[model samples]
Target: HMTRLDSVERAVADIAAGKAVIVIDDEDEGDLIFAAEKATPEMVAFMVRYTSGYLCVPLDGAICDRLGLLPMYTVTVDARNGIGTGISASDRATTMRLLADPTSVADDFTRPGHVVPLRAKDGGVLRRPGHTEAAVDLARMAGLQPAGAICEIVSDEGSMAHTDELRVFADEHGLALITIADLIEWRRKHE
Candidate 1:
């Protein structure tokens, strides 16, 4: 078994390598997260199969403003650069990459699309203890673009995966499991 810090470090390495990690919040729900720029159709398919298919891309507020990504209740978007239907996993992955690409402009996206974009707080997990903030924090800590694709892990029973179930799943899949509290403490000491 790894210590909390070890788990966080492992997760950082995983994200940097474009691999998914499981982050558990205070509410005991686990979210699968990875660097948005590294998203792939296969990865998205795995996330959709095991989690709530509703994928959310967590981006900094400034980036969201620059990309014209509105609030979650307002609008969704798909990359207009190279997409087909914008609902398929391939299309969604392309959209995620565009969202993470700093060079992308507002015109590169069109609204009323598939992927959900979340505006992360300025201080990230230090300011908000939500999964969205954790995702962005992890991505940034991994030395990648400060953007992440997150999806809540759901159990076969059609409910959020509990701590016990999440542990089992993480172990079975060899995923690094860290918590929001873990991130907060790490940032306090290091960031």
Candidate 2:
């Protein structure tokens, strides 16, 4: 088995290589989370496969307060240093806060990368609640790239079932697949 630190390092490299990190938060009953940062149209095409052309984004509270953008879901969490793989909405929010802090955490891996996945109220999934419009707008407000917001769709549903397809796609396109568990374990191992 690969060490969490090794996985963390591998994840960073994969993101740069156009590989999408699959973040399935437990709070959402297996929501397939996607990061907007470092996203290319190529990545969006893959997301569409799972989400059916819709994606939701996590929103940052401070940005909403300043922009008057109401959130669909309000999330909160206690002060923390890092987060686990299947963290709650609040835990995700706390992790976002930790990401914004630049002083540095115990380990560099514990700190979030350039991309910050805030908690959003809606999903960008096609049939259900769509948050793409707001996600794009907020991404601009946050001074993040147009694709800065992380997105997700329900996986338990028939919405996305391309496990094998994704693997081949990743190999053909040289994309890496990392998981939230990898991130959490990396932090834990370092701590």
Candidate 3:
């Protein structure tokens, strides 16, 4: 494989030529992207290099003073939105788009783990039974343990309520019911 920078340059060429829409990579989070339209190509390139990558023509501090080369719009990663820095979204347009609709992120309930991490005070959200069933189907196909076909009640009064239900779900699946803080501890020790 070519060097990472070489791959990025190739992606830039492809995007400029209108051959691809996006370049996605899981690694290389928290990097810089230098981007511009015809309006600010040189300055954008200079900024991209200086902040995101290395400086070219280091001896001449005026790398910023160039008028050649069409401008390239840069993209940065926003993990909350599923795009991050580094090699992914080599093109600017791809970087601007998001993993899912921001407003619809909650209403778009597609995963049970999305609910498994919920607590009672969190608006009493447990996996809807229908979505839970779908999750089970997906999990089984992927050779992963599936969540139940119903929302678990972790609350008192015999049935699991919001938080307690998650514990039951975890127990049934040989998983540990821990808070995010506890999860970090578990991962560090278990990993």
Q: Model 1, residue 68: displacement in angstroms?
A: 2.6
TM-score of 1: 0.89
| lDDT tens per residue, model 1, 1-191 | 33332368889999998899998877647899999999999888778788666789999887888877655535688998688989888999999999999888878889888888899999998998999999999999999889999998875452333666777777787788888998899989988
Better of 1 and 2 by lDDT: 1
* Candidate 2 residue lDDT tens string, 1-191: 22111244554444444344443322232223334454444554455555532243354445443323345423322224454542344344344333333332324233222223343333222112333333333333334533333445423333234344444444564544434444445444653
Q: What digit string (tens of lDDT, one per residue) describes model 3 on residues 41-125?
A: 2332333432323211100011112211122312112223332332232322222221111222332222211111111111011
Every candidate's lDDT: 0.85, 0.39, 0.23
Give candidate 1's whole-model lDDT.
0.85
Better of 1 and 2 by TM-score: 1
User: Candidates' TM-scores?
Assistant: 0.89, 0.41, 0.16
Worst 10 residues of 2 by lDDT: 121-130
**Ranking of predictions according to lDDT:** 1, 2, 3
lDDT of 2 at 128: 26
